[PDB]
Amino acid sequence: GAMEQEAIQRLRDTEEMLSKKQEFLEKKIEQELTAAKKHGTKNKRAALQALKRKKRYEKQLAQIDGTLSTIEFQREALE
Amino acid sequence: GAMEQEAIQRLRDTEEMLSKKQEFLEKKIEQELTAAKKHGTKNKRAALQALKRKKRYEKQLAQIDGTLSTIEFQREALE
């Protein structure tokens, strides 16, 4: 009943925020890989930092994927 | 940023929920060990049932503890 559903809802709210953060990391990747191509020749400094940031978002995005799989598994166990 | 802070708060709310279930399961396990020592070799059927309950709580607890670390580390990664 109510208390059980609440616990599942906490997990759902977390999933939904992490999924939102994924989507935003994907838009950022795309901005960064676009900027690195844009600056490749005329601004090597900006390009190189774009690529470091892209890699950092890629890593953050991986941690988030693993957190989601963990959340889903915990939530199934409670359902 | 704002998105990270919202995600970080929903992670905190999940940790709080998880710690409450953790404390419930830990108590239940303590209670089963205490009862197993008192009851001893009095009744095989009841002992087997109790060993089954204790194993279920231990399995649920191991899951909860794994989820909690994962959520904690994800939160720290967004800060």
From Swiss-Prot, chains A, B:
Q: Which domain of life is it from?
A: Eukaryota
Native organism is Homo sapiens
What portion of the full-length protein is represented by this chain?
23 to 97 of 224
Post-translational modifications reported in the UniProt record = ISGylated. Isgylation weakens its interaction with VPS4A.
Q: Assembly and partners? A: Probable core component of the endosomal sorting required for transport complex III (ESCRT-III). ESCRT-III components are thought to multimerize to form a flat lattice on the perimeter membrane of the endosome. Several assembly forms of ESCRT-III may exist that interact and act sequentially. Interacts with CHMP6 and CHMP4C. Interacts with PDCD6IP; the interaction is direct. Interacts with VPS4A; the interaction is direct. Interacts with VPS4B; the interaction is direct. Interacts with CHMP7. Interacts with CFTR; the interaction requires misfolded CFTR. Interacts with PTPN23.
Q: Per its UniProt record, which disorder involves this protein?
A: Cataract 31, multiple types: An opacification of the crystalline lens of the eye that frequently results in visual impairment or blindness. Opacities vary in morphology, are often confined to a portion of the lens, and may be static or progressive. In general, the more posteriorly located and dense an opacity, the greater the impact on visual function. CTRCT31 includes posterior polar, progressive posterior subcapsular, nuclear, and anterior subcapsular cataracts.
What name is this protein filed under?
Charged multivesicular body protein 4b
Q: What does this protein do, in the record's words?
A: Probable core component of the endosomal sorting required for transport complex III (ESCRT-III) which is involved in multivesicular bodies (MVBs) formation and sorting of endosomal cargo proteins into MVBs. MVBs contain intraluminal vesicles (ILVs) that are generated by invagination and scission from the limiting membrane of the endosome and mostly are delivered to lysosomes enabling degradation of membrane proteins, such as stimulated growth factor receptors, lysosomal enzymes and lipids. The MVB pathway appears to require the sequential function of ESCRT-O, -I,-II and -III complexes.
Q: In which tissues is it expressed?
A: Widely expressed. Expressed at higher level in heart and skeletal muscle. Also expressed in brain, colon, thymus, spleen, kidney, liver, small intestine, placenta, lung and peripheral blood lymphocytes.
Family note: Belongs to the SNF7 family.
Q: What else is known?
A: Its overexpression strongly inhibits HIV-1 release.
Copy the domain comment. Answer: The acidic C-terminus and the basic N-termminus are thought to render the protein in a closed, soluble and inactive conformation through an autoinhibitory intramolecular interaction. The open and active conformation, which enables membrane binding and oligomerization, is achieved by interaction with other cellular binding partners, probably including other ESCRT components.
Recall the taxonomic lineage recorded for the source organism. Answer: Eukaryota, Metazoa, Chordata, Craniata, Vertebrata
* Signal peptide positions (record): none
Where in or outside the cell is it found?
Cytoplasm, Cytosol; Late endosome membrane; Midbody; Nucleus envelope
Impact after mutating A36C: No loss of interaction with CC2D1B and forms a disulfide bond locking the protein in its folded closed conformation when exposed to oxidizing conditions
